[PDB]
Amino acid sequence: DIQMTQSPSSLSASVGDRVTITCRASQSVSSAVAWYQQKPGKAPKLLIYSASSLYSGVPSRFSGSRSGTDFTLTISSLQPEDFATYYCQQYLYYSLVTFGQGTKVEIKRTVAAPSVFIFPPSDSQLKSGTASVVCLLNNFYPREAKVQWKVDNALQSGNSQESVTEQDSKDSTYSLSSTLTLSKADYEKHKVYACEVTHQGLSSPVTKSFNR
Amino acid sequence: EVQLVESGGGLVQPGGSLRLSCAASGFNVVDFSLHWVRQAPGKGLEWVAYISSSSGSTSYADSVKGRFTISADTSKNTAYLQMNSLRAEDTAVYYCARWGYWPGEPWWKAFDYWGQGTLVTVSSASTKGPSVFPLAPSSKSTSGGTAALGCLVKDYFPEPVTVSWNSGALTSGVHTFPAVLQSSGLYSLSSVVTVPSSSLGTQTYICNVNHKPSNTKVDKKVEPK
Amino acid sequence: DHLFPPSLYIFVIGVGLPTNCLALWAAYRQVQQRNELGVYLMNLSIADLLYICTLPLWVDYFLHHDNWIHGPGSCKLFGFIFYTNIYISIAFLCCISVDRYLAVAHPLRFARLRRVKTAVAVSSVVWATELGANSAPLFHDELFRDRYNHTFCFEKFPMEGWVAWMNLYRVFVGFLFPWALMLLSYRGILRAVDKRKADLEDNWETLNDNLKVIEKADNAAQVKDALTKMRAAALDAQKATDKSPDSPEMKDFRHGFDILVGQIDDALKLANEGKVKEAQAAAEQLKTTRNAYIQKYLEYLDGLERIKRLALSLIAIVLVCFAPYHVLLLSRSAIYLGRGFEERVFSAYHSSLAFTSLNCVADPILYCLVN
Ligand SMILES: CCc1nn2c(C)cc(C)nc2c1Cc1ccc(-c2nnc(C3CCNCC3)o2)cc1
Q: Which residues lie on this side of the membrane: Extracellular (chain C)?
């Protein structure tokens, strides 16, 4: 029941930059908050225990502290190796263990809107009784994006999927794609299937569309 | 050397069961409390279960009470998690972690050692090879620029599908998206390569789709109409 | 009227010599126990012997002679000793107030300073600095003949100019600077002690009320959350109990808290099992553990109060022994340096000069405040 809330669910920072991650306990927790670093595909590693002390082997770059119920993790200077998801964890008792939701430290970059492409369904899947329309957003620098699927200008919901790549190892950008799922019966109707893409880096939504 | 080694994961149908193991090296199972921590794909960490073989004390997260049983056998220096009546929601990577006993540093230091983790996937889906579709670019799209060409690898199961282009020759400008689980219980990938518009003609591009679990290899040519 | 100084000095010699010898003995024994304050007290006690060994001649001067039969060098020497005693005593009382401040306010931050070797290095610096500041006449004798007479040993009635300026320096830097530091240390001690004490009451109340609820709780969920907060309080209190020098009493408190936390865990798991007997388990085990550490806690509270008493009594000592002298020295300097009780001021000044010798009595008293 002792919930922990991490504020900066996503934090962008440069290499050499100062990073602060703040976590709040729902109730009093003694200095029994640990911080863990998780890299994709790996089990979490302990960085800080007892809301302060470093675990042996952990670089001096890491530190943290408690102020009442507010706990922080500070990376004094990010190294290329510190871009990881950090978790806040409460340890008052074996059965009461809870984790915060985690905060991801991303590599900071400048802003650029993605290139947007539409990939219509073709005969090789339409013959199976299904259809799918794929909208692709390439090389977006910030993480946040919103993609709306519209058919004959109706806004659809609940019939699409989305997938986002990790920051590219050379560019530090993201690519996003989404798929509109239709049965053949739905694809056989309507004329225009459009992808409306809105980003913080755009002054206005950009649309690309498929006219059957 | 201090190790926690998980094993026993795999594919189970809903309502079925798995017995995960956590072998210890360096330290004994009886020397510390063992915890299972779960990580659903794309989610944060969830504590699942605890055992302390030194006191005979166990506990479970509310989400698994009466469903999971945790036990240990110190004669083999191995702990176990018995997962019965599994639901789709139990798909996750299960990690075994070491937290010591109060008083002192072994307790304040919490999950110092984690095992490698093992994946439990709960699904009614049978093994399926892919349906592979050409996401060919239109010649009218972003004309004069870089075209995005790709392949859609649809309705496959289980998870570990590898897609490469031109048999490993094309790595530059290639984005393979994480598969999305479909409502059908099957998965779908999309793999896109960026190519100079002119290269449309020539440089035929092949999506090489490999599914070890279904002994299936599919080679598709992606070409504009 | 004129017999006051001799009588005060005879009293001071008779009391200070036995008591400065006993103070040096006690301070040395305190040093053997690795109490760094025994070094400062030893430095204080020796300074008070150095002055006392000169007082027997001043009394004879006042009672049997019409002048200073010992010659100008015995006058320059006794003046030097007098000034060094005053400023050595002030500097060491300040050092004591600042290491009690650090000991209570920053118990785990400046641990390297609460050591005998550090205190000796500090005393060496203090002694060299005081001796240098008051040694100027020993390198030029015009100074002693611009400030002091050489037929009687007192400071000349008018002040040359530099004499009043050095008197203002010594009043402001010698007295007022370390006095202000002692007052700041006292208030910092009061704040640090009142905060630690107040924080140690918050934990006691959360523990007490959570135990009361466990006593009357029905559903296991409430026993569980009560134990959760009991544990948080116990860990916070142990943190409050964690100090850098590993004092023997604090180690015992740490062990007691470990026992308490273990009992809380035993009850917490018994409760998770669902056996209602946890109510009596916790209601008896935590009560039994609290039943004995309370007397030690009371001793600790008394110790903190006795630090407050030391800082306040030490300030009172500095203000009774030295304030009337620096006050009349400042008043007699503000006159030369400006434009009538004026002679009337000169036997209140001399009476306050004699009155400053009671720091040879106060110094051996501090022994009853340290331990
Ligand atoms: C307050 C006494 C005192 N103690 N003291 C010390 C410890 C150190 C120093 C540096 N100065 C002093 C003084 C100042 C001081 C004040 C008056 C005299 C003085 N006047 N006449 C005489 C004789 C004796 C009495 N009948 C007339 C002739 O003595 C001397 C000195």
A: 66-70, 142-157, 336-341
Which residues in A lie closer than 8 A to residue C269 (C-beta atoms)?
Answer: 94-95
In chain B, the N- to C-terminal Cα span, in Å, equals 60
Give the whole-angstrom CA distance, residue B72 versus residue B32: 12
> Locate tokens 């360096």: which residue?
B26
Helices (H), chain C: 4-32, 37-52, 55-64, 72-105, 116-133, 142-147, 162-169, 177-216, 220-241, 248-273, 278-321, 323-336, 346-355, 359-362, 367-370
Distances B8 to A41, B80, B94, C57, C58 between C-alpha atoms, Å: 18, 10, 10, 97, 97
* Domain chopping of chain C, boundaries: 4-191+340-370, 194-301
Which of B122, B152, B183 terminates a domain? The answer is B122
CA distance A54 to A63: 7
Question: Rounded CA gap, C329 and C335, in Å?
Answer: 10
The fold for domain A4-107 equals Immunoglobulin-like (2.60.40)
A163/B189 Cα distance (integer angstroms): 9
What resolution in Å is listed for this PDB structure?
2.7
B33: β partners:
B99
- The coordinates were experimentally obtained by cryo-EM
CB < 8 Å from C in window 100-159 of B: 102-104
Domain span at B205: 131-222
Q: Which two tokens stand for residue A23?
A: 């976590």
CATH code of domain C4-191+340-370? 1.20.1070.10
The correct CATH number of C194-301 out of 2.60.40.10, 3.20.20.70, 1.10.260.40, 1.20.120.10 is: 1.20.120.10
Return the domain boundaries, chain A: 4-107, 115-211
Interchain contact, C269 vs B104, CB within 8 Å: no
Residue whose CA is at the smallest distance from ligand 1 atom 29: C62
Beta-strand ranges (E) seen in chain A are 4-6, 10-13, 19-25, 33-38, 45-49, 53-54, 62-67, 70-75, 85-90, 98-99, 103-107, 115-119, 130-140, 146-151, 154-155, 160-164, 174-183, 192-198, 206-211
The backbone torsions φ and ψ at residue B210, rounded to the nearest 5 degrees and listed phi first, read -120, 120
Could you tell me the CATH number of the domain that includes residue B112?
A: 2.60.40.10
**Does any CB of chain B come closer than 8 Å to the CB of residue A114?**
no
Contact indicator for C12, C357 with CB cutoff of 8 Å: yes
**Searching chain C, which residue's CA lies closest to the CA of residue A28?**
C232
Do the beta carbons of residue C270 and residue C277 sit within 8 Å?
Answer: yes
Q: Are residues B53 and B154 in the same domain?
A: no
Residue positions counted in chain B: 225
